[PDB]
Design a protein around this ligand. Structure first.
Ligand SMILES: CCCCCCCCCCCCCCCCCC(=O)OC[C@H](COP(=O)([O-])OCC(O)COP(=O)([O-])OC[C@@H](COC(=O)CCCCCCCCCCCCCCCCC)OC(=O)CCCCCCCCCCCCCCCCC)OC(=O)CCCCCCCCCCCCCCCCC
Ligand SMILES: CCCCCCCCCCCCCCCCCC(=O)OC[C@H](COP(=O)(O)OCCN)OC(=O)CCCCCCCCCCCCCCCCC
Ligand SMILES: CCCCCCCCCCCCCCCCCC(=O)OC[C@H](COP(=O)(O)OCCN)OC(=O)CCCCCCCCCCCCCCCCC
Ligand SMILES: CCCCCCCCCCCCCCCCCC(=O)OC[C@H](COP(=O)(O)OCCN)OC(=O)CCCCCCCCCCCCCCCCC
Ligand SMILES: CCCCCCCCCCCCCCCCCC(=O)OC[C@H](COP(=O)(O)OCCN)OC(=O)CCCCCCCCCCCCCCCCC
Ligand SMILES: CCCCCCCCCCCCCCCCCC(=O)OC[C@H](COP(=O)(O)OCCN)OC(=O)CCCCCCCCCCCCCCCCC
Ligand SMILES: CCCCCCCCCCCCO[C@@H]1O[C@H](CO)[C@@H](O[C@H]2O[C@H](CO)[C@@H](O)[C@H](O)[C@H]2O)[C@H](O)[C@H]1O
Ligand SMILES: CCCCCCCCCCCCO[C@@H]1O[C@H](CO)[C@@H](O[C@H]2O[C@H](CO)[C@@H](O)[C@H](O)[C@H]2O)[C@H](O)[C@H]1O
Ligand SMILES: Nc1nc2c(ncn2[C@@H]2O[C@H](COP(=O)(O)OP(=O)(O)OP(=O)(O)O)[C@@H](O)[C@H]2O)c(=O)[nH]1
Ligand SMILES: [Mg+2]
Lengths: 63, 347, 97, 174, 112, 56, 140, 320, 97
């Protein structure tokens, strides 16, 4: 292969590697914030589903 | 045992595990554990000899005690939360009791003394159920309560299990006690990563089950239960010795074998959380496991021990054991590292 | 659950007993029905990490209803003082108390 | 004094447990467990659970009857041990009663006691519900719901009892 | 979705090609299992039971195809979550003012 | 000299391999008695709470 | 342990050695007692005295190791005017290893204990200087 | 459908095939006592399967083409060499005895499998239950070490426990002086070197240990030389037996299902004949072991599992 | 907490220590197991009854059902242990050391 093909093949490799390297750092920062603040899809530990509550009139008034 | 009775009992063992895994209510989880223990004892007692009786009694006493602590945790959780949902626990004393209860059920150190003895006292097929299927239910509960588990407690058990499993295997010549201590060591890795990434606990669990299932199936094929009895395999089935070698090296975590993957992934997760001293200590201590895997490969595959004259009679007869799934499990036990990114399916 | 087969298949095997704000026979309400419902509705959908922090009031009140620890401490404080005042000839209970 | 009915029963409850936890002859361990089942029924009864209380008493009476039979066959020696006959049994028995007494003394001396965790000693009546005028037992409606609401619970319990018969026969067929 | 191997939203992703290198490896693993099966049972390894050998390959590829599809989907989900979170929290991902090496300073360590 | 004695006797493969043998024997030389194993379960729980506060 | 460990780190390094030595001696004794409980539980003594005599050796051996570690580590820093020096714990660690060898009647253990305990202690001092976590909080 | 739990679940239970002609008969007696001739007659008259006594090549006859294999594939154990030099240094005496026991154990399994699978009774000439008589005579004559006797007991202790003893034990009781005469008439040169003491040790082992034990759990019939001549008399006794003792009365379907599962898997049967107890007599090193094993697989129709050898005319291998 | 809980919790602890500290008779330890269920039953019942959570009133009953299975399972093993050694002593169960 000529120097030009390998040269610009190298650039295409460097771009892909640089893009992945950035996303790897971004993910570690997103995971850090999501876990600390619990305001994202990840680390979303379940709460009790409110559709299980009964809202009918009960046998007594105060409840 | 009537074959139909064995199947129904065997289906009940699975039913209890499935009930634990699909239950959203602490009572049904406890019921699932009781159903599982009820159905497994008759499998342990299947051959009705004093050793099997001892193993079943030691197993029953351990599992019963864990169920009491587990139910105690559930009732304490009920006092301090008024609900039964399977999820984080609302009382730290309840978290400790449940964590310890599950640790005994798994056989984690220092609640490990029963695993070597129960495994040695029961047939190989029963030992396979004990060291593989019986891990699913307790692990699945740990996978749901981990947000409330005390970090020091869970990591203390993991470190102790890896050490005690590593040292315990060095002195064993019985294959069932080697698998027991190997199991204790591997359980440590699963719970060590649990606080950080529960997915890697599932990955380690599945890969441990595939590799443990393969080893037990190969022991059953030639009806070997001791190191020396296994040392005759080269003189009947040469192919089997080669599969034992590859599977044992994989269990030791040697690249490029499948067994390296869970250790590789767990180290990644722990370092991402700036946990450096612990994965380094864990990886080095796992070299104890490799050492007593390498002895078995020496006496099994890489050398040839003396035979006996009567061995010539076995040359004329073929293997007739089922060896169910053995060709598939051994390939999965060894040639899966190139497919590591498939672990995201567990997410 | 580990495997949420109940949600997938739509069957309801054990969710009915999980909470005391769920439908009870003849609509008999639990003592802490209102406190549970408030906490369950506060924390719904936001996750435990957020709920531990943004629903402390609802949970703290619910815990008080369940175990009544603050109330019993208050009563022991009142009862203890009356013993001090009764024993010192300082206060005298009215006829109805 | 009568307001402390539930506490007094709970004191006898623990004493029964010290009775069989000290582990004398299972003949006397069974006796200790029968007593604890009795005052345990009394405790639950005083909280409005007459059915729950009477049943735990009934179940444990049949269980200890089987235990008594098994003791004479498989857990008997020439000189069955009473609480006074053994130093280890007496030492455990004495230790448990002294640990019970002191907990009682402080909680009564102060109306609160700290034994690892804070306990209020105002009497157990203070937590009871004030209002009540339904024309039924709440425990009965809850227990009776096992057959309408608890379809899944009946299946797993029924199966386990059926398997229990199959299992015990396998285990005991040497 | 809850407890679903492939949620419906996964159909917006391009399915794995039938010539995927990862799928070819899975098919190869089935071939090896087929050969081991002949070996342990002591049949001619390459020749025996070609009907059995074809089922080892076919079943591995069948299961592998769906595993690769779920694998791909879970990684698409991870990116979808990550990018939306970055969108939802601009203050936590601020653009760096990028100096050039002409402006930035680096201490020089001679290799003498 | 004595300094190299520490740098050797401590790091010898014999030293490493022979300490693993002691630890192995301590771990595995048990009596197989239900009584002793459960007595140790009691000690593990007590020191877990009293000493490490795992229940706190 | 949490509170006892805190007080050791609470007081400045190289100063108040009597208090430092009290901390390490307490850490030494607790470790010996824990070993004594497991030892007697799993390897039953023949008589009640030998059970006490076995508790006596292990607890004293462990307390001596800690007391010598705390004393040597504190005094070494005090002499050398270098509080936050990892080397001070290296000397404390070896002295402890020597106590184990002296208490054990075996030059093989004393040397090996010196090296491993010497390196371990220096890593501990490095650990809190640099902030290394052994049980790290989940963060990502 | 190969027999297994599924076949049993579908109605292949032993009780459906047994009768009062489903018996396991063993014919015993000293050397040259007329066992084999009597054994054939009993089987012919009762319609039972006759099993010729298990020799060095019994396992050969049940596998492959049925022909004897070269003796290197049996450790070179030699009956003639035993009679010429019973004290040879290479351990031929015990190596033969250990091989013979495993041959009888294999034959006993084959007989039980035939009995259970088809319901037809069988007739054997000696068995694992009476093989020890030669072990006892060999040791009493100093032909084997005490270590060899202990080895034999270990293998027998973990193998003979899993089987049921014969229904009927026929014993032809011939006095020793008569045997020494009959051996002379027979013409076998090696066999003529058997000493009277050896034969009196076999008779002592039989009459003193074997028959008393078999009495407690089997129908033991004994006969003189002249009674043994007419098999019709012997058959008449067998056909009018009671069968009121022994473990065969306590067997049921699930127990015989377990027994059949064992005897049909020959490697499971032979499992403990090769326990790793390194006696010099029966131990073999890797270089000899490896060299003979490679030779074994080169034998015709022996490299692959039966049915997969093209060099002996097996077809459709790519579909099997 | 309420004062009854002090003795019920103490009762569970006493039986737990009872189970963990063995003597000779294996039957004695099986009683300490039934003791733990009895205290668990009682303490669950108090919580459920006091809080007026109706649907869990069946929970203590289900607790007894699976305690009976454990006791029946434990007694079955004691039968086979006794049939082997002639006693229920636990020191005889040490073959697997
Ligand atoms: C909430 C509060 C907590 C609630 C619980 C409160 C307590 C209420 C009571 C509960 C019932 C207790 C049941 C005790 C029991 O069953 O013991 C059986 C057990 C075995 O009985 P055995 O079969 O008749 O054997 C008698 C000889 O001991 C057989 O031994 P020997 O013949 O070999 O004689 C030599 C002896 C000598 O032992 C020694 O080596 C001396 C060791 C000294 C260490 C310093 O060896 C040993 O026995 C070693 C045992 C040492 C125990 C480990 C201690 C460390 O007996 C004992 O071990 C004695 C214990 C009695 C007092 C129990 C104290 C209860 C409190 C426990 C701690 C609770 C913390 C929470
Ligand atoms: C690609 C990504 C994945 C990368 C991971 C690594 C992939 C490799 C994983 C291997 C998985 C196990 C399958 C190995 C197949 C081995 C086949 C073989 O070696 O031949 C078997 C041969 C049989 O001998 P024979 O009597 O002639 O035939 C009887 C069977 N019909 O047996 C013998 O006769 C040999 C007896 C002597 C024993 C020699 C032992 C040293 C040589 C072992 C080589 C295999 C090493 C495998 C270990 C893993 C290596 C990475
Ligand atoms: C495993 C092959 C190497 C054999 C030597 C063993 C080395 C040790 C293995 C340890 C783990 C390291 C694995 C390194 C390979 C994985 C890295 C990788 O290549 O990922 C990308 C790969 C697709 O490769 P790509 O760059 O996109 O080029 C496509 C050209 N058609 O996507 C993949 O993940 C596919 C990886 C599977 C292997 C390549 C499959 C080639 C396709 C034909 C099927 C394989 C049949 C030949 C089996 C060879 C076994 C030795
Ligand atoms: C592209 C392939 C690259 C392979 C990379 C290997 C990576 C490691 C994979 C590990 C798994 C290894 C397979 C499992 C072991 C099975 C082989 C074995 O057990 O022993 C070797 C065996 C020969 O033993 P034998 O008893 O003689 O069997 C009869 C075969 N004629 O069987 C053998 O003869 C050797 C088997 C291995 C050779 C595979 C050959 C590839 C398929 C060729 C297609 C068939 C060509 C037919 C040619 C004849 C027609 C012209
Ligand atoms: C993680 C990424 C990697 C993914 C890996 C995927 C793993 C899962 C894939 C399944 C692995 C097992 C594949 C088994 C292939 C061999 C099956 C075969 O050829 O059987 C031949 C014959 C029975 O075939 P037959 O039952 O008639 O087929 C219809 C099935 N209902 O009878 C025989 O002689 C077969 C005996 C050898 C087989 C071992 C014993 C198992 C028995 C299996 C029963 C049939 C299973 C059908 C497989 C279908 C799978 C889709
Ligand atoms: C959860 C938190 C628990 C933290 C404590 C963990 C310790 C658990 C260790 C339990 C398993 C240890 C088993 C073992 O190593 O053997 C028991 C050992 C008896 O050996 P010993 O008497 O000390 O030495 C005799 C020399 N001839 O007895 C011992 O000395 C082991 C002491 C280890 C304690 C550290
Ligand atoms: C292995 C032996 C097992 C024996 C089990 C014995 C019974 C165990 C009782 C468990 C419940 C004890 O409960 C323990 O004490 C009181 C209970 O109000 C709490 O007390 C503390 O926590 C709560 C938290 O809001 C607050 O009141 C405050 O922080 C503090 O008072 C503890 O946080 C709790 O952990
Ligand atoms: C830096 C980390 C390196 C990690 C390396 C992995 C650790 C693996 C540990 C394996 C240790 C077990 O291996 C064991 O060691 C002891 C050392 O006394 C050997 O012991 C050998 O020498 C001793 C005396 O010196 C003899 O009493 C013994 O008869 C002899 O076998 C054993 O033969 C060996 O089986
Ligand atoms: N050492 C030894 N020799 C045996 C054994 N079984 C047979 N033999 C020998 O093999 C030869 C044949 O055995 P026999 O059947 O008893 O002799 P026989 O000539 O056939 O006399 P018959 O009873 O009439 O058949 C004899 O030389 C036996 O000594 C054995 O278990 N051990
Ligand atoms: Mg003959």
């Amino acid at each position: 292969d000529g120097p030009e093909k390998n040269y610009e093949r190298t650039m295409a490799i460097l771009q892909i590697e640089a893009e992945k390297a950035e996303l790897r750092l971004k993910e570690l920062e997103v995971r850090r914030l999501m876990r600390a603040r619990g305001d994202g899809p990840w680390f979303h530990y379940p709460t009790i589903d409110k559709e299980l509550i009964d809202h009918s009139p009960k046998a007594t008034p105060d409840n | 045992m009537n074959p139909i009775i064995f199947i129904i009992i065997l289906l009940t063992i699975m039913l209890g595990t499935i009930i634990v895994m699909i239950s959203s209510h602490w009572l049904l989880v406890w019921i699932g554990f009781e159903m599982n223990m009820l159905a497994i004892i008759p499998i342990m007692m299947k051959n009705h000899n004093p050793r099997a009786t001892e193993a079943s009694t030691k197993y029953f006493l351990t599992q019963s005690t864990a169920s009491m602590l587990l139910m105690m945790a559930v009732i304490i959780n009920l006092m301090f939360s008024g609900q039964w949902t399977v999820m984080k626990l609302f009382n730290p004393m309840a978290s400790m009791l449940m964590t310890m209860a599950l640790a005994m059920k798994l056989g984690m150190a220092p609640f490990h003394f029963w695993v070597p003895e129960v495994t040695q006292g029961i047939p190989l097929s029963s030992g396979l159920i004990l060291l593989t299927w019986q891990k699913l239910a307790p692990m699945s509960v740990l996978y749901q309560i981990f947000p409330s588990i005390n970090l020091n407690l869970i990591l203390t058990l993991s470190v102790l299990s890896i050490l005690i499993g590593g040292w315990g295997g060095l002195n064993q010549t019985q294959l069932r006690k080697i698998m027991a201590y190997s199991s204790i060591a591997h359980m440590g890795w699963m719970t060590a990563v649990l606080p950080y990434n529960p997915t890697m606990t599932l990955l380690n669990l599945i890969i441990y089950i595939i590799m443990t299932s393969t080893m037990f199936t190969m022991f059953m094929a030639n009806s070997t239960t001791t190191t020396l009895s296994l040392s005759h395999t080269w003189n009947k089935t040469p192919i089997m010795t080669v599969l034992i070698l590859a599977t044992l090296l994989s269990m030791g975590g040697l690249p490029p074998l499948s067994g390296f993957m869970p250790k590789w992934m767990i180290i990644q997760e722990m370092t991402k959380n700036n946990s450096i001293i612990l994965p380094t200590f864990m990886a080095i201590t796992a070299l104890l496991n490799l050492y007593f895997y390498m002895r078995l490969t020496y006496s099994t595959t890489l050398t040839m021990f003396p035979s006996t004259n009567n061995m010539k009679m076995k040359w004329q007869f073929p293997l007739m054991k089922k060896m169910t799934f053995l060709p598939t499990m051994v390939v999965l036990s060894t040639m899966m590292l190139p497919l590591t990114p498939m672990l995201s399916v567990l997410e | 659950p580990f495997f949420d087969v109940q949600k997938r298949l739509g069957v309801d095997l054990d969710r009915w007993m999980t909470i005391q704000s769920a439908e009870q026979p003849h609509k008999i309400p639990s003592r802490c029905h209102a406190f549970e419902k408030e906490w369950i509705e506060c924390a719904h959908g936001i996750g435990s990490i957020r709920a531990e922090k943004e629903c402390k009031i609802e949970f703290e009140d619910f815990r008080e209803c369940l175990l009544r620890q603050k109330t019993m401490k208050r009563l022991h404080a009142i009862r203890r003082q009356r013993e001090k005042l009764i024993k010192e000839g300082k206060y005298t209970p009215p006829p109805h108390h | 004094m009568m307001l402390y009915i539930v506490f007094i029963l709970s004191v006898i409850f623990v004493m029964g447990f010290v009775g069989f936890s000290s582990k004398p002859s299972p003949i006397y361990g069974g006796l200790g467990l029968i007593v604890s089942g009795g005052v345990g029924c009394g405790i639950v009864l005083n909280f409005g659970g007459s059915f729950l209380g009477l049943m735990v008493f009934l179940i444990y009476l049949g269980g200890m009857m089987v235990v008594f039979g098994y003791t004479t066959a498989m857990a008997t020696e020439q000189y069955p041990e009473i609480w006074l006959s053994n130093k280890a049994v007496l030492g455990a028995f004495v230790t448990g009663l002294l640990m019970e007494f002191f907990m009682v003394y402080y909680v009564l001396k102060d109306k609160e006691v700290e034994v690892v965790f804070e306990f209020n000693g105002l009497g157990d009546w203070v937590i009871y519900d004030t209002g009540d005028s339904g024309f039924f037992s709440e425990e009965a409606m809850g227990i009776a719901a096992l057959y309408s609401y608890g379809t899944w619970l009946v299946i797993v319990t029924g199966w386990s009892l059926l398997i229990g018969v199959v299992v015990i026969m396998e285990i005991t067929r040497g | 979705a809850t407890f679903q191997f492939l949620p419906d939203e996964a159909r917006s992703l391009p399915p794995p090609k039938l010539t995927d290198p990862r799928l070819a490896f899975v098919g190869f693993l089935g071939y090896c299992s087929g050969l081991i099966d002949n070996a342990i049972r002591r049949r001619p390894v390459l020749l025996a039971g070609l009907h059995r050998q074809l089922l080892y390959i076919t079943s591995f590829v069948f299961v592998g195809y769906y595993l690769l599809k779920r694998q791909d989907y879970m990684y698409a989900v991870r990116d979808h979550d990550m990018f939306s979170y970055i969108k939802s929290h601009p203050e936590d991902f601020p653009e760096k003012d990028k100096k050039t090496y002409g402006e930035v300073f680096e201490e020089f360590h001679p290799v003498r | 000299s004595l300094l190299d004695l520490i740098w050797l006797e401590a790091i010898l493969p014999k030293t490493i391999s022979l300490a693993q043998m002691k630890a192995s024997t301590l771990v595995t030389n048990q009596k197989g008695l239900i009584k002793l194993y459960f007595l140790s379960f009691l000690i593990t729980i007590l020191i877990s709470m009293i000493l490490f506060n795992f229940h706190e | 342990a949490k509170t006892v460990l805190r007080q050791y780190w609470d007081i400045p390094e190289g100063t108040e050695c009597h208090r430092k030595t009290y901390a390490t001696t307490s850490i030494g004794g607790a470790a010996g007692l824990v070993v004594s409980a497991y030892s007697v539980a799993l390897k039953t003594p023949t008589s009640f005295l030998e059970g006490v005599a076995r508790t006596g050796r292990y607890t004293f051996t462990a307390a001596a190791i800690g007391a010598i570690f705390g004393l040597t580590s504190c005094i070494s820093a005090q002499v050398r005017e270098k509080p936050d020096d990892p080397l001070n714990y290296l000397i404390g660690g070896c002295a402890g290893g020597l106590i184990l060898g002296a208490r054990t009647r075996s030059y093989g253990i004393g040397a090996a204990a010196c090296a491993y305990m010497g390196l371990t202690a220096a890593l501990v001092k490095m650990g809190q200087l640099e902030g290394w976590q052994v049980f790290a909080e989940p963060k990502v | 459908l190969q027999y297994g739990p599924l076949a049993y679940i579908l109605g292949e239970k032993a009780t459906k095939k047994m009768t009062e002609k489903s018996k396991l008969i063993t014919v015993d007696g000293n050397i040259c006592s007329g066992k084999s001739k009597l054994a054939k007659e009993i089987a012919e008259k009762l319609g039972l399967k006759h099993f010729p006594e298990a020799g060095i090549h019994y396992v050969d006859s049940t596998t492959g083409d049925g022909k004897p294999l070269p003796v290197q594939f049996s450790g070179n154990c030699s009956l003639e060499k035993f009679y010429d030099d019973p004290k040879s240094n290479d351990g031929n005496s015990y190596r033969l005895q250990a091989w013979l026991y495993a041959s009888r154990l294999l034959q006993y399994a084959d007989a039980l499998e035939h009995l259970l699978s088809t319901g037809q009774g069988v007739v054997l000439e000696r068995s694992i239950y009476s093989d020890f008589v030669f072990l006892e005579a060999m040791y009493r004559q100093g032909f084997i070490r005490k270590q060899c006797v202990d080895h034999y007991n270990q293998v027998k202790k973990v193998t003979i426990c899993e089987y049921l003893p014969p229904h009927v034990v026929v014993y032809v009781d011939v006095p020793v002086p008569e045997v020494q005469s009959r051996i002379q008439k027979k013409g076998n040169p090696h066999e003529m070197k058997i000493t009277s003491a050896y034969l009196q040790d076999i008779e002592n082992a039989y009459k003193g240990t074997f028959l008393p034990e078999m009495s407690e759990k089997c129908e033991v019939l004994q006969y003189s030389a002249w009674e043994a001549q007419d098999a019709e008399k012997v058959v008449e006794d067998i056909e009018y037996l009671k069968y009121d003792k022994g473990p065969w009365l306590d067997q049921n379907d699930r127990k015989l299902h377990k027994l059949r599962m064992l005897v049909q898997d020959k490697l499971e049967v032979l499992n403990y004949t090769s326990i790793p107890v390194f006696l010099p007599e029966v131990t073999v090193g890797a270089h000899q072991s490896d060299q003979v094993f490679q030779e074994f697989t080169e034998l015709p129709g022996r490299k692959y599992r039966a049915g997969y050898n093209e060099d002996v005319g097996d077809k459709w291998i790519w579909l099997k | 907490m309420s004062m009854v809980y002090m003795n019920i919790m103490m009762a569970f602890t006493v039986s737990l220590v009872g189970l963990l500290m063995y003597r000779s008779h294996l039957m004695s330890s099986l009683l300490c197991l039934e003791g733990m269920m009895l205290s668990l039953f009682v303490m669950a019942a108090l919580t459920i009854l006091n809080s007026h959570f109706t649907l869990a009133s069946m929970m203590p009953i289900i607790l007894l059902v699976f305690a009976a299975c454990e006791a029946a399972l434990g007694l079955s093993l004691l039968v086979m242990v006794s049939n082997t050694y002639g006693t229920d002593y636990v020191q005889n169960l040490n073959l697997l050391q």
